[PDB]
């Protein structure tokens, strides 16, 4: 009785996978540089609190 829902789930899963595969490289480059600036923010937490 819940097979149309299964078809909907599989179709949505394929579409979402394609969307994420398209959007992943920008997100991962941003995550690399965000890791760099996050390391910088971590090394100076006291400076940020005083600020």
């Amino acid at each position: 009785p819940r097979m149309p829902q299964i078809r909907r789930d599989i179709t949505g899963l394929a579409n979402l996978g394609e969307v994420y595969a398209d959007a992943s490289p920008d997100l991962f480059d941003g995550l690399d540089n965000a890791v760099t600036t996050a390391r910088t923010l971590n090394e100076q937490r006291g400076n940020l609190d005083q600020a």
């Binding site: 819940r2 829902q5 299964i6 909907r8 789930d9």
Partner: protein
């Protein structure tokens, strides 16, 4: 003779393997029935999130 040869070829030494097959099938089916409400919830509610 032909049928017995075919049965020997198909069931040569599959004793343990067929036993494992049947035991696995029964265990999986029983556990699946025992956990059918989570499967129903996954199937009927994963659509909205993925579609969004």
């Amino acid at each position: 003779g032909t049928l017995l040869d075919e049965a020997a070829t198909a069931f040569g030494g599959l004793g343990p393997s067929l036993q494992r097959l049947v035991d696995s099938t029964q265990a999986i089916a029983g556990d699946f029935r025992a956990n059918i409400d989570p499967v129903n919830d996954i199937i009927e509610n994963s659509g909205p999130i993925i579609d969004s």
